[PDB]
Every structure is written in C-alpha cells, then in structure tokens.
Design an enzyme around this catalytic site. Structure first.
Site, short mmCIF file in Angstrom:
data_model
loop_
_atom_site.label_atom_id
_atom_site.label_comp_id
_atom_site.label_asym_id
_atom_site.label_seq_id
_atom_site.Cartn_x
_atom_site.Cartn_y
_atom_site.Cartn_z
N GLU A 134 -6.33 -5.61 -7.58
CA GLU A 134 -6.69 -4.67 -6.55
C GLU A 134 -7.33 -5.44 -5.42
O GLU A 134 -8.16 -6.32 -5.66
CB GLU A 134 -7.60 -3.57 -7.08
N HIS A 183 0.83 -1.20 0.00
CA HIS A 183 0.00 0.00 0.00
C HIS A 183 0.87 1.25 0.00
O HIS A 183 1.86 1.33 0.73
CB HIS A 183 -0.95 0.00 1.19
#
Length: 477
Positions: A148, A21
C-alpha cells in the site's frame, strides 16, 4: 530512532515511481487531469494522521476499490488508472502503522498530523535523499504480497495520470467486467465467461439435463425457502438490497456446487445448468411466504445477484489460501472458527492518545459461509473505532468497511463487499482503535468485553437472527 520505524531494506529512491489507483464511475476521465483532495468527508482516513491519496503496486487490488460507493455490493465499477510522479521519489517503508510512535522515533512534532508533516519541504529534504517528495510504504494486507502506498495530498498534485482500463467502456452486465479483469492474476484457475453463462441460463428456463451430485452432499431445497423468506416487496425491486439479502444466507454452496475445497461446477455448462434450477425453485417458493413478490424476480434480479456471488467466491478460490491454522485457541459456533491471531491482539492497552491494531483469524469447515459483519466496543472520547483502518482480508483481498455507530456505546461494521469463508478461503479481521484523549478506562464504561463477529442469518423461534461468535479481550495495564 528512525531505524526503529523505518525499514531501509525496502526503502528506496526510484525515477518515475508508479502505482495504480481504483476509480469510481464518473471520475475515470476526470482524475486523468490531476488528482485533488476531495471535499470534506472520508478524507482518505478517519485518523487525522493518515489523510491522503492511497495506491498500490498491484492493479488487481486497486480494481476492487472502483465500485460505486452508493452501491457497494451490486453497483458499477469505474476503472483503474496508473499514476506516476515526475523525477525522483522516495519510497519510505514503515515497520509499524502507529502514527505516534513514528512521530517520536522520527523526531517529528508530536503536535502535527503525520501525513501533514510528510508533505512539507523540510520533511522531504530530511528523509528524501534528494528524492523531491516522500511516499510511505506499508504491507497491503495479510495474505497479500502487495504494497500500500500513501501519498501526501499536496505533493500528489504532481502526479501524471494514465488510463489503465475503463471497466464501463467495456459494456458488460453486472460486474462481469471487473471480475474478468481480476481473473488475469492467474496464469489450476477457474475463469468463466459470464455472458455465455447468463444467456445460456434463461434459455434453460423452458417449461416442461446432464448433471450429477456424485461426490457432493449439498442440496437445493433449503435455500429456496430460505431465499423466499427474506425478500419483501421493497427488496425484490432493488438489486443492491437484494444482493445484501442473499449475501448473508447459508448454504449458497449448493447452487455453486462448492464443497471439500474445490469448484465442482467447473465448466461453462455445469454452472449454467445449475443456476437455472435454482431460479425456478425460488420462483416456486415465493407463493408460500412473500406477498405479490413477482415471480419475474426469480427470473431477473435473483439471477443478476446470484451471479455476482458466484463471482466473489470464484475470485477467492483463485487466490492463495491464507494460512489456515489458528495460532491461538479457536472458538467454534454454528460451524465457524474464530481465533486471535496472537495472544497480544486480545489485549487493549490504555494510557494512550495513540492508536492500536488487532487481528482475528476467521475460518470455516467446508462450504462458503457469509460474514455479515462485526460488532465493536466504543467509549465516546476514550476508545473510538478507526473506520478507515478496519478491514477484512480474504485470501489477500482487502475489503474496506462501512461503519455506523449503533450505540449504548457499541459500533457496527459492514464489509463493502461480500465476505465468505470456508475450506480454502480464510480471512483476517483487522481492527483499529483511535483515542481522542488518553483519559482512563476500567471496564466500567464498557458494556461488553468482547468483539462480536456476525455470521449467516437464521430462523429461531420464528424471529430473524445472526449467528454470533464473540471473542474476549482484556483491558489491562
């Protein structure tokens, strides 16, 4: 049922499930202590149904989401962290990204928000196969092999977080750090060392060599006047506003020596030699249009900003080319190419409280041409634009979008990074609507029946204009 929205072949339970992230400056130390849902705002999503912590299987993709959100074009980049769940985790892969279909076919409350249900105990026990929590998986973007990941905010509290890289710590100028990291995805590639470049360039601003435009066609003259024409006093004393300005200009390909689909300023020295010459012509170009804009500008901010653009389009030509051939009839204008990816994208159905998605392919003929943004239809309570789910994918790179409502009931969207297209660099504008209510629409509350893609900036009868290609849709059934 569950089999119509879930893909079993990419669904699985794995121990110590992990992803990467991107982190914005000033939080790279802070989130290693745990991830918590931010204070009210962007939320992870505009759509209630999609609130959550987002991650990917690819640390180069997450990287791109680390730039300061107050300075998206020129600003600093924080870092990338690796996040890992303890024990068993269910990855649940989805065949569609419409949150109403899912709720129906999965037998969920059509009442409550999807990502809200996803984090409950009873949802986990019913889809988790003992895996302690579910995470939804989705294709990351077109042109991308990536994935994702969507984590429920509450459940995400159990992540353990590790530093993967801090871009600031590495102490470089501009976004040199970030683009050097991304160029690792290349085991031909075009990796330039950029402090050897920036210094080797202002050493070449002498007062009073070895380059040849064999092979090329593109020339410098136009750019400089073009440049000197856009920069007012307030722009030149701001690197962010400067970059935005040069980002929407034509003919940048001639500094960069890019044509025919190849990077012909290949070496550290060919490039260094080229930017230098640019810097001075621009310096020599301001005493024709701009007031007291200092010639230092053409030596400092101009150089800092142009370097950045060399870095965006370099990063692009290092990625595979998205499949060029439009599979529908292209609209050409000012040298571009715009086409619905499939006929079905060009229809906006109604009779929905639910959401929809739409794909437009964008191509360009030769040299890097900017995409200033896109223009979108808007009915206040029947047809809203999903800020979070609208993006532009450029050879796989998902560029998120900032969306403000200009109006008359029409909405605008700027990319949060420079977009260019051209021979070998193609984009997918993906658009998503969200309807608060399923009231009705005929084209008698729409003002325009098209989607306007905005290209480079232009001078016509002495007035500032963006080259516009529209694409016509149809609201029926």
């Amino acid at each position: 049922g569950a089999d119509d929205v879930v893909d079993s072949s990419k669904s699985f339970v794995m121990e110590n499930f992990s992803s990467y992230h991107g982190t914005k400056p000033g939080y790279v130390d802070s989130i290693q202590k745990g991830i918590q849902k931010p204070k009210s705002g962007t939320q992870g999503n505009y759509d209630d149904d999609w609130k959550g912590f987002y991650s990917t299987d690819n640390k180069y993709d997450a990287a791109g989401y680390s730039v300061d959100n107050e300075n998206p074009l020129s600003g600093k980049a924080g870092g990338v962290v690796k996040v890992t769940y303890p024990g068993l985790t269910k990855v649940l892969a989805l065949k569609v990204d419409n949150a109403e279909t899912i709720k129906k076919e999965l037998g969920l409350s059509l009442t409550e928000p999807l990502m809200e249900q996803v984090g409950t105990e009873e949802f986990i026990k019913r889809f988790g196969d003992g895996a302690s929590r579910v995470v939804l998986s989705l294709p990351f973007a077109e042109g991308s092999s990536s994935v994702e990941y969507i984590n429920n905010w509450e459940q995400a509290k159990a992540l353990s977080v590790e530093l993967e890289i801090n871009f600031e710590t590495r102490g470089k100028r501009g976004q040199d750090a970030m683009y050097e990291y991304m160029a690792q995805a290349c085991a031909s590639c075009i990796n330039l060392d950029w402090d050897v470049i920036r210094d080797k360039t202002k050493t070449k601003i002498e007062s009073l060599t070895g380059t040849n435009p064999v092979f090329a066609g593109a020339n410098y003259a136009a750019w400089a006047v073009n440049v000197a024409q856009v920069i007012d006093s307030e722009t030149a004393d701001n690197l962010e506003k400067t970059t935005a300005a040069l980002s929407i200009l034509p003919g940048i390909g001639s500094v960069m020596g890019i044509a025919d689909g190849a990077v012909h300023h290949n070496t550290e020295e060919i490039v260094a030699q080229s930017i230098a010459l640019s810097s001075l012509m621009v310096a020599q170009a301001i005493p024709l249009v701009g007031e007291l804009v200092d010639i230092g500008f053409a030596a400092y901010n101009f150089v800092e900003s142009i370097i950045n653009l060399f870095q965006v389009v370099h990063n692009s030509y290092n990625r595979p080319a998205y499949s060029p051939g439009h599979k529908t009839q292209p609209f050409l204008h000012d040298g571009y190419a715009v086409s619905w990816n499939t006929v079905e994208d060009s229809i906006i159905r109604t009779g929905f409280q639910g959401e929809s998605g739409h794909d437009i392919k964008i191509t360009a003929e030769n040299t890097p041409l900017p995409i200033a943004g896109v223009l979108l239809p808007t009915i206040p309570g029947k047809l809203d634009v999903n800020k979070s789910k609208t993006h532009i994918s450029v050879n796989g790179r998902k560029i998120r979008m900032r969306c403000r409502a200009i109006d008359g009931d029409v909405t605008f969207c700027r990319p949060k990074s420079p977009v260019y297209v051209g021979n070998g660099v193609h984009a997918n504008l993906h658009v998503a609507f969200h309807r608060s209510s399923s009231e009705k629409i005929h084209s008698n509350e729409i003002s325009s029946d098209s989607i306007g893609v905005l290209g480079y900036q232009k001078t016509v009868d002495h007035t500032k204009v963006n080259s516009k290609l529209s694409l016509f849709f149809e609201i029926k059934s």
